[PDB]
């Protein structure tokens, strides 16, 4: 199902007109192009780059697939018409002569044999006379933009004759038939059976094509090639008996999805996604759609793409599945495609980790709150950084919290410590740090990393009976009473006491309980002070004694209880309703 799903959606993309290879081609990113006429003579070295801020190697042209050279005598291989800048002009930037001269010498022989096997074209004769001149190729080096081609290594030079606009030399009607025949003649005379992806006949495809968009260079997916990696004496390729009509298909599918809109990173891992075999579509929905419903691969992937993006954007919503979405989580090792994630299930089962992370992040929110119900991940980490979301640790914060949230893993203690530092540093606990601590505590309880305590709920836990949670509620109600006393507060009891209240309770609460009756007497509404005193009694009832110091989990409980109580007091009719029920 790993590679069968790739062939299955390649057969859908090739039939739905999505712009993909057709038997022996590949959407290879070719930078600079070569323009000729009908008998050679270099014209202009046009470049089709200018795309992203990082200038890629031009546009992905539908050129024949690379035969996979790689070797000490890599010159003897040589592709069709597109190749290397040392394969066309015999010029090497960091490889030297001879090694690159043989590349061009074999490329000339390949072009000559292609012209002999396909005459009367007015396109292959031009490139045959251009490679057998030893003058125009040197004129290519003196072009107007040749200095830019020598800078970027791996400049693939493709030939494009005149009087054809965007039609390449290898994109002609006759060269297309030659490419289709090459994949049906010289590629159809290898080992017999038995295929693994499709499982039918077809010849076993040795030397799997490379896949671009993973490691440092285009590397094949199924690529066994070592003295110990071989199976039962198959010796590379034959260990996975896969046919050409499946190997080429899935390699081109990977190359196309790793260069378009399907490529998106989960947690430091570039994962390609594509829709599975869609439903045949009911009549009431397919009647308005002409066609009707075409099983397009890159169509309903936007749901899971937004979900993996809403995790960083806060626009998450519980999705109803029943629509399977493939998710091949490839990752780059040294130069091998490491598969990290693969789930055939729909978006509902794919979003279980996000749902658990956001339910553990579900915190109390007041009326007309600017913070959404689900907080974005960068906005959530911004409460843990220094000032701007950029100073976070790129190994345990912006590089590990996303992985732990997108896979329902265990949250590290680094979250505890950073949220603690930024809570007692900023002297306030806004929406972002307390929800993170609640999620950490819930995940530690669910993963056995927390014993005596228990999981937290959304609303305020008036029981808990923990030594840190009730202390947080105590600090919250103390700050609320102080704010109700002085409306225009500047240096609140929070901004001066929360630094040690989260750590040493007997030092801060030894004076906050002294300052509290004065704040209650300062209140213009005596009934409000009465209700606040009753609720602080109910809070401190669960605390049998003020501890000497709050442990690392106790400070998190302190922050969680603080936010819970400070949002329960700022609710419509919550404290009054609680006081009336006594």
């Amino acid at each position: 199902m790993i590679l069968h799903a790739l062939t299955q959606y390649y057969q859908r993309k090739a039939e739905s007109d999505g712009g993909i290879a057709q038997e022996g081609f590949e959407n290879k990113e070719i930078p600079f192009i070569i323009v000729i006429d009908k008998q050679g003579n270099f014209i202009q070295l046009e470049d089709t780059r200018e795309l992203k801020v990082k200038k890629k190697v031009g546009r992905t042209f539908l050129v024949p697939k690379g035969l996979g050279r790689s070797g000490s005598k890599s010159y003897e291989v040589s592709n069709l018409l597109w190749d290397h800048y040392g394969y066309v002009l015999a010029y090497a930037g960091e490889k030297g002569q001879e090694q690159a001269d043989k590349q061009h010498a074999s490329f000339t022989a390949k072009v000559n044999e292609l012209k002999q096997a396909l005459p009367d074209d007015a396109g292959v004769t031009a490139v045959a006379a251009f490679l057998s001149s030893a003058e125009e190729k040197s004129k290519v080096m003196q072009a107007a933009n040749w200095a830019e081609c020598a800078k970027v290594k791996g400049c693939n030079l493709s030939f494009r004759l005149v009087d054809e606009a965007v039609d390449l030399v290898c994109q002609s009607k006759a060269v297309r038939e030659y490419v289709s025949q090459a994949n049906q003649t010289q590629s159809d005379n290898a080992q017999k059976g038995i295929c693994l992806v499709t499982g039918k006949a077809a010849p076993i495809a040795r030397l799997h094509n490379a896949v671009k968009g993973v490691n440092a260079k285009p590397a094949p997916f199924a690529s066994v090639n070592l003295s110990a990696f071989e199976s039962y004496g198959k010796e590379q390729g034959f260990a996975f008996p896969i046919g050409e009509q499946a190997m080429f298909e899935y390699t081109t599918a990977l190359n196309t999805l790793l260069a378009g809109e399907n490529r998106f990173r989960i947690g430091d891992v570039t994962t390609v996604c594509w829709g599975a075999k869609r439903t045949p579509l009911e009549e009431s929905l397919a009647s308005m759609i002409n066609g009707g419903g075409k099983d397009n691969p890159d169509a309903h992937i936007d749901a899971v793409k937004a979900l993996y993006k809403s995790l960083y954007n806060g626009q998450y919503c519980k999705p109803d599945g029943e629509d399977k979405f493939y998710l091949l989580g490839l990752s780059p090792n040294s130069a091998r495609i490491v598969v990290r994630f693969w789930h055939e299930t729909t978006v509902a089962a794919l979003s279980e980790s996000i749902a658990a992370w956001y339910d553990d992040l579900q915190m109390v929110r007041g009326e007309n709150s600017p913070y959404p119900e689900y907080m974005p991940l960068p906005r959530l980490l911004g409460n843990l950084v220094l000032d701007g979301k950029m100073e976070n640790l790129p190994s345990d914060l912006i590089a590990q919290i996303t992985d732990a949230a997108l896979n329902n893993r265990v949250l590290p203690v680094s979250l505890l410590q950073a949220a603690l530092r930024r809570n007692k540093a900023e002297q306030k606990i806004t929406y972002g740090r307390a929800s993170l601590l609640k999620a950490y505590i819930n995940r530690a309880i669910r993963a056995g990393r927390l014993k005596n305590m228990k999981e937290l709920t959304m609303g305020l836990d008036r029981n808990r009976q923990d030594i840190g949670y009730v202390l947080g509620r105590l600090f919250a109600v103390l700050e609320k009473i102080q704010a109700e006393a002085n409306p225009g507060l500047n240096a609140t009891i929070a901004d001066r006491y929360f630094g040690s209240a989260s750590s040493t309770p007997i030092a801060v609460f030894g004076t906050l309980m002294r300052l509290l009756p004065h704040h209650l007497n300062k209140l213009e509404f005596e009934g409000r002070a009465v209700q606040l005193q009753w609720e602080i009694r109910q809070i401190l009832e669960h605390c049998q004694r003020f501890p000497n110091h709050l442990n690392l989990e106790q400070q998190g409980l302190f922050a969680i209880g603080y936010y819970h109580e400070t949002q329960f007091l700022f609710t419509k009719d919550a404290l009054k309703n609680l006081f009336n029920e006594a």
Binding site: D268, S395, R449
Partner: protein, 264 residues
Amino acid sequence: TIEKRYDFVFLFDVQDGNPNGDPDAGNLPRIDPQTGEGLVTDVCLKRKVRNFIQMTQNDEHHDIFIREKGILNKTEAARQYMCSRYYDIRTFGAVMTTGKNAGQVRGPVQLTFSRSIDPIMTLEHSITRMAVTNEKDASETGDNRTMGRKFTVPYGLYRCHGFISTHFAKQTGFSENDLELFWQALVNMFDHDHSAARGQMNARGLYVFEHSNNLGDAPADSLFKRIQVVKKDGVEVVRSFDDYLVSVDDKNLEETKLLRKLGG
């Protein structure tokens, strides 16, 4: 060659250090992605056995083949010679390229992914350095520093399992001396294989189940359940051996099996 089946329940822990970090996300210990228990690969224990045998023996008929470059620095004829003049070949197996079944040597000793009893806690203990290696892009004019990362574990009694069968010993040459050396390794390999990242590890209980029959008249799951490793009563979280309760059950194996307590 031996003549009995040995299915031991190896017990080893980690006091303070990285047991088996996962290169999936750097070097954090391979915890269970669903229950939080540490999953130490058996290949690490096999490498530790190889290192102990290389340190202790240092002679012929007991080499390692699969050795290290920093620690120490017709068809059946070659296979028999490699089985005779090497220890790892008789122990965990071999793969002579000019062998029989596609060139394979299975070997008796078959280990098991060490799963921790209680869910361990990956302590992301980053540790900085005051000196960079190569010319870093950020090593400007000030202090050439590089932020480190060495995960640690407070505790985690990993449960390793083995399955020594005399059937493969009859072909690999795993005699009783090699078995005694394997036991001495599993007992004393955690006192020599130490470093700044692995920390301090020790062997707990080497409860070997010696079966009288060559086929082994005991199931693996039953022998593993007979060695119950759970937490103590008043202990809230395990921190040493005084926090666990490795209660052995040698009441139903007193007919033909032998519970060899070579470690604990």
